Design a protein around this ligand. Sequence first.
Ligand SMILES: [Mg+2]
Ligand SMILES: [Mg+2]
Ligand SMILES: [Mg+2]
Ligand SMILES: [Mg+2]
Ligand SMILES: [Mg+2]
Ligand SMILES: [Mg+2]
Ligand SMILES: [Mg+2]
Ligand SMILES: [Mg+2]
Ligand SMILES: [Mg+2]
Ligand SMILES: [Mg+2]
Ligand SMILES: [Mg+2]
Ligand SMILES: [Mg+2]
Ligand SMILES: [Mg+2]
Ligand SMILES: [Mg+2]
Ligand SMILES: [Mg+2]
Ligand SMILES: [Mg+2]
Ligand SMILES: [Mg+2]
Ligand SMILES: [Mg+2]
Ligand SMILES: [Mg+2]
Ligand SMILES: [Mg+2]
Ligand SMILES: [Mg+2]
Ligand SMILES: [Mg+2]
Ligand SMILES: [Mg+2]
Ligand SMILES: [Mg+2]
Ligand SMILES: [Mg+2]
Ligand SMILES: [Mg+2]
Ligand SMILES: [Mg+2]
Ligand SMILES: [Mg+2]
Ligand SMILES: [Mg+2]
Ligand SMILES: [Mg+2]
Ligand SMILES: [Mg+2]
Ligand SMILES: [Mg+2]
Ligand SMILES: [Mg+2]
Ligand SMILES: [Mg+2]
Ligand SMILES: [Mg+2]
Ligand SMILES: [Mg+2]
Ligand SMILES: [Mg+2]
Lengths: 233, 252, 121, 52
Amino acid sequence: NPLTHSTPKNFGIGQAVQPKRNLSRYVKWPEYVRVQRQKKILSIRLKVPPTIAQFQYTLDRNTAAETFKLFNKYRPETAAEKKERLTKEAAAVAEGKSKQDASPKPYAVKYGLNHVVALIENKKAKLVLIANDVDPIELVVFLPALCKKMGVPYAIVKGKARLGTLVNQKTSAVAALTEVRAEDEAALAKLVSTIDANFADKYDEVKKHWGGGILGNKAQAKMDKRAKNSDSA
Amino acid sequence: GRVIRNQRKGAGSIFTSHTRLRQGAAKLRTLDYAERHGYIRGIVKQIVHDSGRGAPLAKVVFRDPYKYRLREEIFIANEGVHTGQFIYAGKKASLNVGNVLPLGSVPEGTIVSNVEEKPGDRGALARASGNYVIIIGHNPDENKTRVRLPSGAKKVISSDARGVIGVIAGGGRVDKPLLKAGRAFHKYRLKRNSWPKTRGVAMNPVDHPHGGGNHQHIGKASTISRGAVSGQKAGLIAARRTGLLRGSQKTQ
Amino acid sequence: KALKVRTSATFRLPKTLKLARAPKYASKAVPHYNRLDSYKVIEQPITSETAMKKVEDGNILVFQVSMKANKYQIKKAVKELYEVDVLKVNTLVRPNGTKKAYVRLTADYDALDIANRIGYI
Amino acid sequence: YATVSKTHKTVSRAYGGSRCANCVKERIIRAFLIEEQKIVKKVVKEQTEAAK
RNA sequence: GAUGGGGAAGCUCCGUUUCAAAGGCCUGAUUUUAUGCAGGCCACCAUCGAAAGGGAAUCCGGUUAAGAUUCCGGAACCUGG
RNA sequence: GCUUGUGACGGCCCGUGAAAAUCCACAGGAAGGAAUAGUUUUCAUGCCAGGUCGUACUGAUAACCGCAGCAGGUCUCCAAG
RNA sequence: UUGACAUUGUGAAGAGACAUAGUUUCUUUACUUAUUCAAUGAAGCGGAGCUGGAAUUCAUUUUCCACGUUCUAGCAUUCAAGGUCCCAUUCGGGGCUGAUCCGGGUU
Ligand SMILES: [Mg+2]
Ligand SMILES: [Mg+2]
Ligand SMILES: [Mg+2]
Ligand SMILES: [Mg+2]
Ligand SMILES: [Mg+2]
Ligand SMILES: [Mg+2]
Ligand SMILES: [Mg+2]
Ligand SMILES: [Mg+2]
Ligand SMILES: [Mg+2]
Ligand SMILES: [Mg+2]
Ligand SMILES: [Mg+2]
Ligand SMILES: [Mg+2]
Ligand SMILES: [Mg+2]
Ligand SMILES: [Mg+2]
Ligand SMILES: [Mg+2]
Ligand SMILES: [Mg+2]
Ligand SMILES: [Mg+2]
Ligand SMILES: [Mg+2]
Ligand SMILES: [Mg+2]
Ligand SMILES: [Mg+2]
Ligand SMILES: [Mg+2]
Ligand SMILES: [Mg+2]
Ligand SMILES: [Mg+2]
Ligand SMILES: [Mg+2]
Ligand SMILES: [Mg+2]
Ligand SMILES: [Mg+2]
Ligand SMILES: [Mg+2]
Ligand SMILES: [Mg+2]
Ligand SMILES: [Mg+2]
Ligand SMILES: [Mg+2]
Ligand SMILES: [Mg+2]
Ligand SMILES: [Mg+2]
Ligand SMILES: [Mg+2]
Ligand SMILES: [Mg+2]
Ligand SMILES: [Mg+2]
Ligand SMILES: [Mg+2]
Ligand SMILES: [Mg+2]
């Protein structure tokens, strides 16, 4: 009111400099950004073969949460914990005479791609987790097939870094169980079951399904509106 | 023998254009948001001579829709446009001399200049003093528009090709006899080093297909084939006929 | 939640931390001693007869002086080496490629007096 | 011109040492009239809208 | 004619703002303290290329065997602080 | 009158006869500012400073290029009766 | 220059054989991510919506266009004035709105 005034402003072409807006949709990202985005895009426009694309189908947050909860107990020794265990055994064994068995038989998760493979081959794993990332995918593409034929229950899980957190590596490609306390044997059969139900059981069917072939939405709408009008007038 | 004249032109040593005095390139506005949804007003601030060009240019200044400032464009002036005039560029603009409009929004028979071959190439067809192009059709599905170029050729382009209503200014320039050598001289002095022209037939054989002989003569047909090769193509390249043209031309 | 909000459509190289040099060994062990002290600046008197004349008539000391050295450096080095005040200092390169400084003393000083105190005549 | 006092570089009137008086006279009239005629345009088309 | 680049077995050739994450000014925030962050800009993209083109500002008198719009005398002017 | 400088004009052109550094002005109004005393260095006066390299002479029927103190060649300013 | 092979992928109709099930191969004509070409200090794209309204209603909307600028050689910039919510009221300052949503495919 005062000596103050409502002036509005006309931004309708041919008048008033346009105001500041969010041009984020328009900014000219660095080539490296551009490339990693179009890698994602090109990678879906192509029809992808069924031995890839059995990935993309990842374990879900709920089941997976339960499947970390279990594993997270079974982490491998910490550096201190081993130092600690050594001195425990280095001392106690060599004198109290113990058979280098003043240590308890350890239960931890098994890891490293090459390790886990031979475990599968030897029917020793009971639950193999495979990461959904992994950039030279070949490292891991054969694992579903592998598990399935060794009759090993598996799941393709979101997060190679998260497989890393539970093993103190930056990333871990694969994580597996082979051992387990009787206290946990139970929830493991349960965990395994859901997991088989989404993967190993669904494996043979997934294997027939190509993926991708997906339009961007500017040319989705193009055909969603071409196909709405043309046929049903 | 030697490399003939028309082969040395390509390396552009003494052969580049004489550029120092030219006003700048002549171009329509960048086909931005204003021009393709509505129109935008400008003012021709000056219409002016471009060295080595037939037709005068028109400095036309507009407002920047995005910054507080004046961005000035260089147009080729259509006959009639004037200092002070307001120029309107845009889809939804009106049909008077000087304005710039997408060939879509002009009835057939409209007469426009500086037209784009594809939308937004900032102007490509009929720019020479005198020249223009006439819209002869439209095909609203796949919005094409058909025009007759100055040559005589008819072509079709996007209806979003922009043109400018009118003809290019300074026409008739070519009706005035040059009269003397010196005027051609000063003519090409502001163009390129293409004048005068020694006849190939006054040269020696190292110099030319046409060189040599105890009298001056071409000594073989001067209609050369398309398939011919550099050093061979002097004369009537790919000529599909030859001789004095008789009776009305004009394409049918 | 959601994304950023760039209002410009040009992306620029982030202004990232420029750390300064903290070596681990020294550049050269022992810094060079002053490469152009007054004794190296002002080389000899010039005692050509015509130079002597500038000394008796002009209150000017004429020195052959380091090529490497400038009008500031010549001035300060005379000022320092000879207890004297200086008005202005013209210089020139001689044709045997050596530098001559005409050095004008202020009106308090008698350069001629000061000539036979440095000890030339 | 950087060695001379600012009165050598202007005349007092709006747009002093930049535009030529008669020219300022002119743009003032034009400014006033257009802004006035502007108001005319608005109340006339406000009328159109409620009488059509 | 360097540069992200693209050619070429390679000596090197092409490109010069070019399919590049290209850079820096004003002061504010410091009163641990010397300068981090706070804005807001500006996106101009090397550089070399004129002793006849462009261009801040000096004149007279006097003086030397040989310098002088350069020294001496007097009297000015510009640029930075 | 002569040489030169400059002005307002006029003829000419299908020829209409550079660029950049740099300087100023204006539009704008962010801001900062008085009465117990504030604002102002585009007014005057006053203080300090101004580096580096070239500077001699010849420029021609002997100081340059023509084997040379060669009747050749080699860009220009000043101009009395 | 002309052909073949490789770069080379996705539909659809049509021909072509085991000899009238569809693995395969070409003619046509679709698609876009390869490849190609223009553009711009990658600025306003594609989709939906508000409003208006032409439109004619065979239950009610079945749609289509629009959806801030054209007497004048002016002026158009300080995240925008207005409106509204906060800070603990200081001067300053900050959201939201003004300027509608959704997809980050610069066109
Ligand atoms: Mg443990
Ligand atoms: Mg040859
Ligand atoms: Mg050129
Ligand atoms: Mg010639
Ligand atoms: Mg001829
Ligand atoms: Mg001829
Ligand atoms: Mg001959
Ligand atoms: Mg020949
Ligand atoms: Mg021949
Ligand atoms: Mg012949
Ligand atoms: Mg003949
Ligand atoms: Mg004395
Ligand atoms: Mg000197
Ligand atoms: Mg005045
Ligand atoms: Mg004012
Ligand atoms: Mg180069
Ligand atoms: Mg230079
Ligand atoms: Mg110069
Ligand atoms: Mg000069
Ligand atoms: Mg002397
Ligand atoms: Mg002399
Ligand atoms: Mg003198
Ligand atoms: Mg003096
Ligand atoms: Mg004095
Ligand atoms: Mg001063
Ligand atoms: Mg003369
Ligand atoms: Mg003129
Ligand atoms: Mg001025
Ligand atoms: Mg402020
Ligand atoms: Mg002053
Ligand atoms: Mg300095
Ligand atoms: Mg001299
Ligand atoms: Mg001589
Ligand atoms: Mg000689
Ligand atoms: Mg001679
Ligand atoms: Mg083919
Ligand atoms: Mg764009």
